[PDB]
Design an enzyme around this catalytic site. Structure first.
Site, PDB file in Angstrom:
ATOM      1  N   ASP A   1      48.245 -32.208  22.597  1.00  0.00           N
ATOM      2  CA  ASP A   1      48.518 -31.058  23.587  1.00  0.00           C
ATOM      3  C   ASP A   1      47.056 -30.649  24.085  1.00  0.00           C
ATOM      4  O   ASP A   1      46.274 -29.832  23.691  1.00  0.00           O
ATOM      5  CB  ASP A   1      48.794 -29.889  22.699  1.00  0.00           C
ATOM      6  CG  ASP A   1      49.432 -28.823  23.412  1.00  0.00           C
ATOM      7  OD1 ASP A   1      49.132 -28.527  24.497  1.00  0.00           O
ATOM      8  OD2 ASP A   1      50.126 -27.843  22.875  1.00  0.00           O
ATOM      9  N   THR A   2      47.020 -31.024  25.487  1.00  0.00           N
ATOM     10  CA  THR A   2      45.937 -30.760  26.272  1.00  0.00           C
ATOM     11  C   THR A   2      45.886 -29.121  26.458  1.00  0.00           C
ATOM     12  O   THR A   2      44.823 -28.723  26.769  1.00  0.00           O
ATOM     13  CB  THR A   2      45.882 -31.316  27.558  1.00  0.00           C
ATOM     14  OG1 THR A   2      47.018 -31.096  28.209  1.00  0.00           O
ATOM     15  CG2 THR A   2      45.665 -33.059  27.294  1.00  0.00           C
ATOM     16  N   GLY A   3      46.919 -28.460  26.668  1.00  0.00           N
ATOM     17  CA  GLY A   3      46.879 -27.195  26.644  1.00  0.00           C
ATOM     18  C   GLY A   3      46.457 -26.390  25.591  1.00  0.00           C
ATOM     19  O   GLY A   3      46.384 -25.199  25.646  1.00  0.00           O
TER      20      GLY A   3
HETATM   21  C1  LIG Z   1      46.670 -22.921  20.027  1.00  0.00           C
HETATM   22  C2  LIG Z   1      47.847 -22.806  19.995  1.00  0.00           C
HETATM   23  C3  LIG Z   1      48.713 -24.145  19.865  1.00  0.00           C
HETATM   24  C4  LIG Z   1      48.279 -21.234  19.563  1.00  0.00           C
HETATM   25  N1  LIG Z   1      47.774 -22.632  21.743  1.00  0.00           N
HETATM   26  C5  LIG Z   1      49.026 -22.630  22.439  1.00  0.00           C
HETATM   27  O1  LIG Z   1      50.141 -22.318  22.251  1.00  0.00           O
HETATM   28  C6  LIG Z   1      48.782 -22.288  24.170  1.00  0.00           C
HETATM   29  C7  LIG Z   1      48.883 -21.148  24.572  1.00  0.00           C
HETATM   30  N2  LIG Z   1      48.668 -20.713  25.960  1.00  0.00           N
HETATM   31  C8  LIG Z   1      48.541 -19.424  26.515  1.00  0.00           C
HETATM   32  C9  LIG Z   1      47.754 -18.415  25.962  1.00  0.00           C
HETATM   33  C10 LIG Z   1      48.285 -17.118  24.908  1.00  0.00           C
HETATM   34  C11 LIG Z   1      47.391 -16.442  24.371  1.00  0.00           C
HETATM   35  C12 LIG Z   1      46.056 -16.562  24.644  1.00  0.00           C
HETATM   36  N3  LIG Z   1      45.460 -17.659  25.480  1.00  0.00           N
HETATM   37  C13 LIG Z   1      46.315 -18.546  26.076  1.00  0.00           C
HETATM   38  C14 LIG Z   1      49.548 -21.708  26.595  1.00  0.00           C
HETATM   39  C15 LIG Z   1      49.610 -23.332  26.440  1.00  0.00           C
HETATM   40  N4  LIG Z   1      49.944 -23.151  24.959  1.00  0.00           N
HETATM   41  C16 LIG Z   1      49.661 -24.598  24.728  1.00  0.00           C
HETATM   42  C17 LIG Z   1      51.195 -25.114  24.509  1.00  0.00           C
HETATM   43  O2  LIG Z   1      51.240 -26.635  24.924  1.00  0.00           O
HETATM   44  C18 LIG Z   1      51.725 -25.206  22.993  1.00  0.00           C
HETATM   45  C19 LIG Z   1      53.491 -25.898  23.064  1.00  0.00           C
HETATM   46  C20 LIG Z   1      53.519 -25.798  21.474  1.00  0.00           C
HETATM   47  C21 LIG Z   1      54.936 -26.397  21.218  1.00  0.00           C
HETATM   48  C22 LIG Z   1      55.517 -27.487  21.560  1.00  0.00           C
HETATM   49  C23 LIG Z   1      57.064 -28.014  21.609  1.00  0.00           C
HETATM   50  C24 LIG Z   1      57.863 -27.071  20.924  1.00  0.00           C
HETATM   51  C25 LIG Z   1      57.156 -25.877  20.635  1.00  0.00           C
HETATM   52  C26 LIG Z   1      56.021 -25.321  20.658  1.00  0.00           C
HETATM   53  C27 LIG Z   1      54.315 -24.967  23.660  1.00  0.00           C
HETATM   54  O3  LIG Z   1      54.201 -23.641  23.770  1.00  0.00           O
HETATM   55  N5  LIG Z   1      55.253 -25.464  24.422  1.00  0.00           N
HETATM   56  C28 LIG Z   1      56.313 -24.835  24.891  1.00  0.00           C
HETATM   57  C29 LIG Z   1      56.337 -24.549  26.388  1.00  0.00           C
HETATM   58  C30 LIG Z   1      55.487 -24.199  27.263  1.00  0.00           C
HETATM   59  C31 LIG Z   1      55.678 -23.713  28.510  1.00  0.00           C
HETATM   60  C32 LIG Z   1      56.902 -23.948  29.109  1.00  0.00           C
HETATM   61  C33 LIG Z   1      58.080 -24.458  28.346  1.00  0.00           C
HETATM   62  C34 LIG Z   1      57.733 -24.879  26.743  1.00  0.00           C
HETATM   63  C35 LIG Z   1      58.496 -25.434  25.887  1.00  0.00           C
HETATM   64  C36 LIG Z   1      57.697 -25.900  24.759  1.00  0.00           C
HETATM   65  O4  LIG Z   1      57.452 -27.331  24.873  1.00  0.00           O
END
Ligand SMILES: CC(C)(C)NC(=O)[C@@H]1CN(Cc2cccnc2)CCN1C[C@@H](O)C[C@@H](Cc1ccccc1)C(=O)N[C@H]1c2ccccc2C[C@H]1O
Ligand SMILES: [Cl-]
Ligand SMILES: [Cl-]
Ligand code: NA
Lengths: 99, 99
Positions: B25-27
């Site tokens: 996860d790059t984000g």
């Molecule tokens: C360290 C931690 C993991 C808590 N970071 C994050 O969650 C960050 C948060 N910021 C934000 C932030 C929040 C608070 C403070 N600073 C920054 C936005 C980007 N996310 C990263 C996301 O890529 C994480 C994934 C996790 C996941 C993947 C698959 C299934 C469930 C959970 C995520 O949230 N992805 C979801 C996703 C995302 C966007 C659109 C659609 C979807 C569906 C799903 O793929």
């Protein structure tokens, strides 16, 4: 090009006729952007990540410029902490992870 | 390897003597794994996702293995819907974003 991850992979994008900063997020299934005005009709959608779900509006076939490239696809709008470029758009850019 | 983004970039990882499935996860700034037993002392921390913040336990100097490559760093343990390999570990594996 090649983007290292020593810092957040933030890039400038153009969407809704506006220039914004967004995160290239391989962990995101979809692309979600802060409140902004998009054309056309939308459908409701629930997207979930850490901390639970949020309600967003789904607009389709939306044009978006990212790193000098054009992508046309689904864009979700809602209360997301940061603008996120997900896999649906990253694949259009021919993006891959390498190591 | 070169990994496409048509589907979630899941991989097998070795951590805490156990094998698990995790998402590249790059984000994600941090690396967070579902409840798992880790040695050493830990510190409490709050991390924010698109849905809000969750409370996690922060372990340091944790080793993880992915595709024959090893990395050491901080690992956060808590109620995450998916196991996430973040930038703090992705950099150590020499993982980059390419297009
Ligand atoms: C360290 C931690 C993991 C808590 N970071 C994050 O969650 C960050 C948060 N910021 C934000 C932030 C929040 C608070 C403070 N600073 C920054 C936005 C980007 N996310 C990263 C996301 O890529 C994480 C994934 C996790 C996941 C993947 C698959 C299934 C469930 C959970 C995520 O949230 N992805 C979801 C996703 C995302 C966007 C659109 C659609 C979807 C569906 C799903 O793929
Ligand atoms: Cl799309
Ligand atoms: Cl670290
Ligand atoms: Na993903």
């Amino acid at each position: 090009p090649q983007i290292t991850l020593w810092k957040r992979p933030l890039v400038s994008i153009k969407v809704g006729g506006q220039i914004k900063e967004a995160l290239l997020d391989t962990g995101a299934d979809d692309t979600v952007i802060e409140e902004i005005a998009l054309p056309g009709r939308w459908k409701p959608k629930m997207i979930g990540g850490i901390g639970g779900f949020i309600k967003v509006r789904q607009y389709d076939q939306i044009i978006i410029e990212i790193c000098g490239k054009k992508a046309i696809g689904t864009v979700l709008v809602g209360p997301t902490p940061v603008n996120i470029i997900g896999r649906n758009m990253l694949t259009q850019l021919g993006c891959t992870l390498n190591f």
